[PDB]
Design a protein. Structure first.
Length: 436
């Protein structure tokens, strides 16, 4: 009742072109002011959770999807490509590729029984999918051993069946019996537990095509030409001593990364096993299939100054004769030392120093992205993005990531957003983890 008032205002600020499940879950309520951070449930142990499949309706069965298995992995990225978009007439479909899930679902500690799904009894048609992955989080100072949930899907025909809860309850059951009792999840929708909210953004890499596909618009009193001239990128990258990410660099970067990253209230703590895996893709993939692109700067001697990364996630375009596909390059994790010889992160000179470097690197991330035959480069106002987003012509994008923490309460973490939904250039963000 007094929880809905605060909720509506949250949806209202996220306005853009009752909850009888989470009601019964360990999630921070809207009106809940957190005095002390930590778990919500009384600490349980494996033996309190039964190993039995949760009752689905008639005609459905549970199923683990082995990623390594060609057959099953297809059933996943087929269900996703066709249903993971709300509107049928949108003009765009998601394009999850065998290369993508072999990167995103194959992380150190990945259990095949943790890549959950629902199939039909008679047909074997995969009509649901919610997977997870084991990680440790850095929820404001404390270390939280948890699991990242992503890629939730229910087949479009079976929407409003309250089957989502069941798919959560089950993935909760399967994780809990492994001595892992928390989670981090992100969604576009508003739910009881928002620890932070971030806004999406767009750097137009191929404006022409983006405008010819209805994915961006023409501003008033502006020529089509004017926009093409505005977003005109060069062909070659500018910052000296820049190259790709070899294995030889790993030990040097890993440190530089978590060193830089230990400034965000919420982070995912990396091990050199899951770090190599996240930032190096399959041995030899062609440019049109390659998933993750990581770049680094080697100082003449051999020192590593700064690194960045980004991942391709393409759309398939429908009703358009000229174009059949649209390339999207999402900004991922990055590090830099330009603000290391300073004592305060919010020091004016140290902010300038972090800025003019982040501007250099990300501008180059854009070029290298355009070169990777992508059409738009995406960012999140999370991390230290706010320093460059305005400058680098990253247009304001309608759409908000709401960050949630299952079975754990924490104070609001800056998400790079001012009261009125503008980029917070003075405070930036303490959100350091990037979800897909
Ligand atoms: C121990 C470790 C386990 C920890 C558990 C971690 C939490 C896991 C949480 C999952 C993290 C996902 C993170 C991602 O990957 S977000 C990605 C989800 N995908 C999309 O939005 C694109 C495709 N969309 C769909 O498939 C939708 O139609 C779905 C199936 C998602 C819901 O459409 P539908 O109309 O078929 O729903 P329903 O009738 O089955 O179920 C209704 C209930 O479900 C709640 N709902 C709906 N969508 C979401 C959502 N995205 N996160 C959390 N909750 C969601 C909703 O509030 C309602 O509950 P309540 O408001 O009445 O209470
Ligand atoms: O990029 C989009 C859309 C994204 C979107 C939508 C709903 C929920 C989530 N979410 O993460 O929970 C979304 O990311 S909707 C959309 S339309 N576009 C691109 C677009 C904008 C404008 C015209 C055409 C195409």
């Amino acid at each position: 009742d007094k929880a809905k008032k605060l909720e509506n205002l949250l949806k209202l600020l996220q306005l853009n072109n009752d909850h009888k499940f989470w009601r019964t879950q360990p999630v921070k309520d809207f009106d809940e002011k957190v005095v002390e951070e930590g778990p919500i449930d009384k600490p349980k142990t494996p033996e309190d959770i039964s190993d039995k499949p949760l009752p689905l309706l008639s005609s459905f069965e549970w199923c683990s999807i082995d990623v390594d298995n060609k057959k099953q992995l297809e059933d996943v990225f087929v269900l996703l490509n066709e249903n993971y978009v709300e509107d049928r007439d949108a003009g765009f479909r998601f394009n999850y590729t065998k290369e993508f899930f072999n990167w995103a679902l194959k992380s150190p500690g990945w259990k095949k029984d943790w890549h959950i799904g629902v199939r039909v009894k008679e047909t074997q048609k995969l009509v649901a999918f919610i997977s997870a992955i084991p990680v440790t989080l850095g929820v404001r100072g404390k270390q939280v051993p948890s699991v990242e949930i992503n890629f939730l899907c229910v087949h479009k025909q079976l929407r409003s069946k309250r089957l989502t809860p069941v798919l959560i309850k089950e993935i909760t059951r399967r994780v809990n019996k492994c001595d892992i009792w928390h989670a981090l999840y992100t969604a576009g929708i508003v739910l009881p537990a928002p620890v932070s909210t971030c806004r999406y953004t767009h750097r137009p890499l191929n404006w022409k095509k983006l405008y010819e596909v209805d994915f961006t618009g023409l501003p008033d009193g502006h020529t089509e030409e004017d926009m093409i001239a505005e977003n005109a990128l060069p062909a070659k990258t500018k910052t000296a001593g820049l190259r790709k990410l070899k294995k030889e660099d790993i030990d040097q970067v890993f440190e530089l990364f978590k060193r830089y990253q230990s400034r965000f209230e919420l982070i995912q703590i990396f091990t050199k096993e899951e770090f190599e895996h996240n930032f190096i893709g399959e041995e030899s993939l062609p440019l049109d299939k390659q998933v993750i692109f990581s770049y680094v700067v080697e100082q003449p001697d051999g020192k590593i100054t700064d690194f960045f990364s980004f991942y391709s996630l393409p759309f398939t375009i429908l009703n358009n004769t000229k174009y059949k596909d649209l390339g999207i390059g999402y900004l991922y994790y990055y590090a830099t030392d330009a603000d290391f010889q300073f004592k305060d992160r919010f020091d004016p000179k140290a902010t300038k120093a972090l800025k003019t470097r982040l501007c250099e690197l990300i501008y180059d991330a854009c070029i290298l992205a355009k070169n990777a035959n992508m059409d738009v480069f995406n960012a999140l106002t999370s991390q230290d993005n706010t320093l460059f987003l305005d400058d680098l012509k990253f247009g304001p994008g309608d759409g908000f990531l709401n960050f949630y923490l299952f079975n754990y309460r924490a104070k609001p973490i800056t998400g790079g957003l001012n009261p009125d939904n503008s980029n917070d250039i003075k405070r930036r963000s303490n959100v350091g983890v990037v979800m897909l």
